[PDB]
Design an enzyme around this catalytic site. Structure first.
Site, PDB file in Angstrom:
ATOM      1  N   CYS D 190      33.192  39.788  45.217  1.00  0.00           N
ATOM      2  CA  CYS D 190      31.901  39.071  45.670  1.00  0.00           C
ATOM      3  C   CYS D 190      30.755  40.220  45.950  1.00  0.00           C
ATOM      4  O   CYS D 190      30.618  40.322  47.093  1.00  0.00           O
ATOM      5  CB  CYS D 190      32.010  37.736  46.462  1.00  0.00           C
ATOM      6  SG  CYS D 190      30.746  36.938  46.742  1.00  0.00           S
ATOM      7  N   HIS D 242      41.106  39.358  32.061  1.00  0.00           N
ATOM      8  CA  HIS D 242      40.261  37.820  31.719  1.00  0.00           C
ATOM      9  C   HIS D 242      38.930  38.122  32.468  1.00  0.00           C
ATOM     10  O   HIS D 242      38.428  39.256  32.453  1.00  0.00           O
ATOM     11  CB  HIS D 242      41.468  36.948  32.574  1.00  0.00           C
ATOM     12  CG  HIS D 242      41.884  37.172  33.724  1.00  0.00           C
ATOM     13  ND1 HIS D 242      42.836  37.989  33.927  1.00  0.00           N
ATOM     14  CD2 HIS D 242      41.608  36.647  35.103  1.00  0.00           C
ATOM     15  CE1 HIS D 242      43.075  38.034  35.269  1.00  0.00           C
ATOM     16  NE2 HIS D 242      42.580  37.179  35.728  1.00  0.00           N
TER      17      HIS D 242
END
Ligand SMILES: *[C@H](NCC(=O)O)c1c(COP(=O)(O)O)cnc(C)c1O
Ligand SMILES: *[C@H](NCC(=O)O)c1c(COP(=O)(O)O)cnc(C)c1O
Ligand SMILES: *Cc1c(COP(=O)(O)O)cnc(C)c1O
Ligand SMILES: *Cc1c(COP(=O)(O)O)cnc(C)c1O
Lengths: 466, 463, 463, 466
Positions: D190, D242
């Site tokens: 993040c 992914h």
């Protein structure tokens, strides 16, 4: 077969002349030289007599309450007495403190504690070596773990502000939150200032870590009450028994007992952990003769005479420091609160590496040591000077001022030689230029002569020529 | 200060009477008692005088030619001399062997080696404690690692055949292939037989492991050539300097140099670096001087003879006890000690060591190969080094055996009075509280101490 | 974008022909070949369809009721359902057993457990590789630790009696007292007999260690009740979800709850925390759906029957090979595989596996208990799960045995032509370069592949 | 016994309705909701079809050049093809880079590398979690080691300047000299800004450590060339397949090959170390179906359509960020250089903890995450928002602006409830007030309705209703 019996008595002087001769030459060297190595001192004759006792003979693994063998009636009187004197000397309440008097030496004491409170790979933080820390507090590079501490445990040091020479407590407080030390060390090998034990306690409790003090260098000072005691905020205090405490070579481990923190309260479990780690953990039969010598040293340490000795030690240091300042030398952190000072020789265009060897040739004993600044560890700027040893010989302020002058004469000599070698010369060459050049060698002889004459003026503690 | 000087030069007798008084009482206890504890002995006066020298003052971290501080001119003469005598005493060629004389004691010497050759969690195998091994060779349970060795390293012991009392070398050879030890230890704390160093070398080389010998108990014997030398097949030999070598408390680490097979040996630097700056700080030079003195004395024919005597005494003692009906583990001994299995008398060393102690006969308990419980060891360990250094001969020991026997009988009596079943604390209570017994103890203590007084007590004049 | 959409919804056949072509060729190879590799099988179409679901998209790190992110309403229904079926399929009482269905595969499941119950350097014992154990149970040499297990932990294997091919439980029981394992593994990669879980439990409790079973190879058998269940004595059971359980590649960790003896079991949280946030990240929900489907199918009588067939096929195969003069390690099997000791034919599995392969008969080599060299394994491992899922029956396998025999003869021929002594690369050279041989291979390959074509190939319609 | 055969074919819809029903409900949830969780995305139908192939069936421990079993002719074509596409997609020269395509997932890839280059207890440094780092980069407290990384290895994190939200590289550079890391991690979970790979390379080489990049979150961006590539300065690059790369769940490990440093040169030995660590070190048979799905994803990743998709992803983020700024929200580091932003909700009097749950009830998916400032980890100030997922559905700047408004409506609701609870109320109570209070529950329903209507406007990648 008959003589074998005559062999066990036969004094050392007769039984082995080669060793005896060595001991003599050493005793004599110690006499005519000027000992300024911070960690050195001279044990009293009482202490030395103890080491020779029959206490060498008994094996007593275990502790007073429970030994592996019997017939320890007296060893128990001894060890016990020794502990009573160790807590007593430091004005410790036997209900808040306990003490192990079995370590064989300083380094062993520290390791025993790490082995008891940290455990394999546990994290430990200590003063970074080049900033004045000790090997046993951690010592590794980016490629290898050298110190036993840095091998069996995970160590990360904290530094000192390179512009004040003081320990940067703010940075340490910050880093502890990232490193999560299980134990923080409060102790130095070459640091002229008191440690902020109170601060370090806040930092340790913040991370739930133990605060271990290593007072090997100030143990004697602490006793005379000449420097703040580390027992006020620390959970454990390890120490050597020689150096400033002036006993034989051994070590002790002080640990707290009782309620640690409320809420409802939790207790201190240090006692058994530490005792079990010393034995049967790390050591075997204790060296009782060394313990007797420590006991003797602790009795002597509680005397007002010792008390005074220490006040003198610290005052000598100050005068020495002042005298060198006046001669234009730079003292790290500008001064000292104890028995030693780190003289930054950069302010004279040389380094401790070359300087320690020249001073040595003049019979002025001391050692090099990097200063906070120093960019290279292979050319330390400083010289460390301690006053414990010479003070035990009786030197006072006036005496040290003369000493300072002798050291200065040396630094000048050291400089004379260095400019006589080249900017890119090695310590090997430097040393070699000092060995095969009558020019300098003559100068050395001159100062050595003066140094040794002055030293002869003072007595040499110990036995009658031994 | 006016007085500060006199203090530092004052004698111990005046400076500190409380300590002095203790040393005295100890010296006297050592005199009237009979020391049969295998690890005990008496250092000569010469060795003791060295410990008191000014050698205590000098700090010399490092090694001759590699010291941190200067002014080590003499310490260097010393350490060096000490090594020359250590290799010399064992008839070692300085080109095939080196030696570190800085260890503070026995245990430290071993650890230094582990720290140098094994490394954290490296595997180590040694004689299992209850079979006669030493803590430093490994000591852990199924739930905790007690010994420093067993904490920082991964140890697994090998046992001895419980029916011969001998080390089961076949099982060890097999298990080594499964455990992959990095180092196998050859040394014992209570084993009366020589070790098959030659076998152990085959086993070590098979697994590419190092073979470290710990001759703390037979160091003196090895020197006199009374027992096979471990230097013939081992890569490293650690030892205490006291015990049978009769010096002050310290330790040494012998290591090979030269060609191992081309391949060489790298033990030297590893071991030296591990002792320092690895594990220790400034070496105790006074202890090193005392060792040097001990090694000079160890190379004399008088010492040589002393050792022959030590072993002969042991045999006679063993024979005398056999004749009295006692069972000796493995049936006899090749050295200075024997493990007497007291099961053959209906008692255990636990109770017996304490009773004999009260009679001033010093010794200690120790489980025998059989023993199902470690909380009731069947054996008593008896060594002859100490009493031999006092002059005892075969005839003398036979009398000693009798005294010990008288003791075993007494310890048994306190037993029959307590009942075939009773806790150890119950037993000791009777020993103390009971006219007939505490009285019996007094009687034998008296005889024990009178006999002991007949012999001299090595050491400094009078303490 | 105009096209960006169509791309994401386009079929694989159009979107990527190169990959599609590969999948095709593979599907076809699987068809005409004879799969005898013990660990192989064929997942049903239902299981395969699940892996393709949108379950790939959702991130659900954590556990039902303890997810980091929200919107896990359905993933929760799934994981939970999966656990209900995992305990159900094995007739486990949800009050005595729990199960983690997040492992990515077999090896990961084991490691999770070690990381939870053992801890860094904790000791672990398992079947020695050359005796039929798995890497994850420990694998190191005298100089290096290869397996993750053998690196982060301290492993020591136990062997099998080289004359019975059975696990020597007596030696293990003895060594455990010396090694002090924190965890003993009960599981095999190439062992045709049931494991004495009851014995191993006595041994584990004796040393206070945990008994972990690794039923990766017999998971399906255990469900059908064709082999004794390891849940009767074990504390933990790890397993792959493919192989004999015939699901997609994944793994599970079964652990006990309730009372252990008062004392309880704390396995649950330890193991769950170790899988996450310990070792893994977001779980592969599509793989979990595929497992769930597999478990539903595993509880059907059809599966139940499939398994009975698997074991019977193995027996018939074993008998047919015995009759052809082949030696079967331990003489037979209790499950889905057999280790055929080719020494009894003058060759080794190393050369033999490669020749049989060229004939489209899939299998692999594996040392037999005896074997002195690991670079010339005597055995061939043969399993029946795969071919059974295609419908093969006793009669069918007997023909298979013949084909394998024809192969062993061929592999031997290439041998006699090379000489009793020759390196493996020499051998393969002849196999390839030699009219009579490469030709022989072609002949048998043809027969092998014709026969194989007779049976269907489970999976999605046509690839 | 007969049906068993019919059992292996029987479609999933028939064979197992309970699982099928779940998959449907999930597919439908994914449709009507608004996915803003940074790590989420939608795999194409091609990728998903691969996972179902017969590639599930073959065991192939080992690697293409050498496997434990035979019959791997095609698996080899596959794995090999996959590697060619992995190096190709990132414009890597096969002579300077190699790649392992066997990791089962992201976390496993990292561990394989640690196990290969660090070794038990080796030191590792990574971004501190509360500052935006990932568990696998290290995660422990002063009393326990939680992450596998922090258990088998010795980890110490570096933080970010709490006033700029940026990584404090100066402090890291300093601490590395004290910690002696064997490996420094460059990767975030993040963090809205590019990493100074060039700086980190200087810091790594200074301490002789390896510089491993973990681009799991920006892997797709890196390919389109929308953010600086980490392959320019790093020794190793691990990544999930992914997230922004939009493939199935798996992981890859990129490692350098060739000359590392001169003098006279030394080579890179990463290849074999890493390969051996994945297998036979850590894993067993590779999941070939997952590898096929990755290969498909890499082919798709090199298309201009993907290239464009990414440009869109980043632009959407900017517009979203701008829209929220305009609504008065505070964005950490004031903006973003990639696919996500950390919205500091302190500037609205609430926290992400309460906010994520309310937004969730409205079918707006996202998650909480502490902001650099935050004093308590039990009341994170921020919400993390990513645009990969919604962009793959076709949303553009205009669309996101509407999204921003929906999120804002949510934050307002969240605030309404919080003032309705009390200053010293728990998250448990907060959540419970939101569940049993028709007052708020009604509001939720209203916004959920709007949220779900809007979402229905866009398509949902994947299979035809699966
Ligand atoms: C000596 N301890 C034997 C006993 O039974 O008391 C010993 C040692 C330890 O020596 P230390 O001086 O530190 O106590 C180490 N290794 C061995 C084999 C023995 O015998
Ligand atoms: C499966 N490998 C057996 C073989 O011979 O190929 C296995 C595993 C590993 O499963 P994975 O899915 O990761 O490959 C772990 N433990 C056991 C006992 C077996 O049999
Ligand atoms: C000197 C010193 C030591 C070393 O003591 P030794 O007894 O020589 O082994 C250990 N710690 C500190 C802090 C010291 O100053
Ligand atoms: C998401 C993420 C992971 C987790 O990946 P998994 O495949 O779920 O196990 C690992 N590392 C980083 C840097 C990430 O952002």
């Amino acid at each position: 077969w008959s003589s074998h019996e005559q062999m066990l008595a036969q004094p050392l002087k007769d039984s082995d002349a080669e060793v005896y001769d060595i001991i003599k030459k050493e005793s004599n060297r110690q006499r005519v030289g000027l000992e300024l190595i911070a960690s050195e001192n001279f044990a009293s004759r009482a202490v030395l007599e103890a080491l020779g006792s029959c206490l060498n003979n008994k094996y007593s693994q275990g502790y007073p309450g429970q030994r592996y063998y019997g017939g320890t009636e007296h060893i128990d009187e001894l060890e016990t007495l020794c502990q009573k004197r160790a807590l007593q000397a430091y004005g410790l309440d036997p209900q808040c403190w306990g003490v192990n008097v079995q370590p064989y030496s300083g380094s062993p004491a520290n390791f025993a504690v790490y082995t008891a409170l940290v455990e394999p790979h546990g994290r430990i933080m200590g003063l970074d070596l080049p900033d004045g820390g000790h090997l046993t507090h951690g010592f590794m590079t980016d490629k290898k773990k050298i110190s036993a501490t840095s091998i069996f445990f995970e160590s990360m040091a904290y530094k000192v502000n390179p512009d004040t020479g003081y320990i940067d407590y703010d940075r340490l407080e910050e880093n502890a939150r990232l490193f999560h030390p299980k134990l923080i060390i409060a102790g130095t090998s070459c640091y002229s200032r008191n440690l902020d034990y109170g601060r370090l306690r806040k930092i340790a409790d913040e991370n739930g870590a133990y605060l271990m003090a290593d007072m090997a260098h100030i143990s004697g000072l602490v006793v005379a009450g000449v420097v703040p005691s580390p027992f006020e905020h620390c959970h454990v205090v390890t120490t050597t028994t020689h150096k400033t405490l002036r006993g034989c070579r051994a070590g002790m481990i002080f640990y707290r007992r009782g309620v640690r923190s409320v809420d409802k309260e939790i207790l201190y479990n240090l006692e058994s952990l530490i005792n079990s780690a010393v034995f049967p953990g790390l050591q075997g039969g204790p060296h009782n003769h060394a313990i007797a010598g420590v006991a003797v040293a602790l009795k002597q340490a509680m005397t007002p005479e010792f008390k005074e000795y220490q006040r003198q030690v610290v005052a000598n240091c100050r005068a020495l420091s002042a005298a060198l300042v006046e001669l234009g030398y730079k003292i790290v952190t500008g001064g000292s609160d104890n028995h030693l000072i780190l003289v930054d020789l950069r302010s004279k265009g040389t380094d401790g590496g070359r300087a320690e060897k020249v001073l040595e040739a003049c019979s002025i004993a001391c050692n090099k040591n990097t200063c906070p600044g120093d960019k290279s560890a292979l050319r330390p700027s400083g010289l460390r000077l301690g006053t414990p040893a010479l003070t035990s010989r009786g030197l006072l302020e006036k005496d040290f001022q003369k000493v300072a002058h002798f050291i200065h004469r040396g630094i000048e000599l050291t400089v004379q030689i260095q400019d006589d070698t080249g900017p890119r010369a090695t310590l090997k060459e430097f040393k070699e230029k000092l060995a095969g050049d009558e020019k300098h060698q003559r100068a050395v002889r001159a100062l050595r002569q003066e140094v040794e004459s002055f030293a002869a003026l003072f007595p040499l503690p110990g036995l009658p020529g031994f």
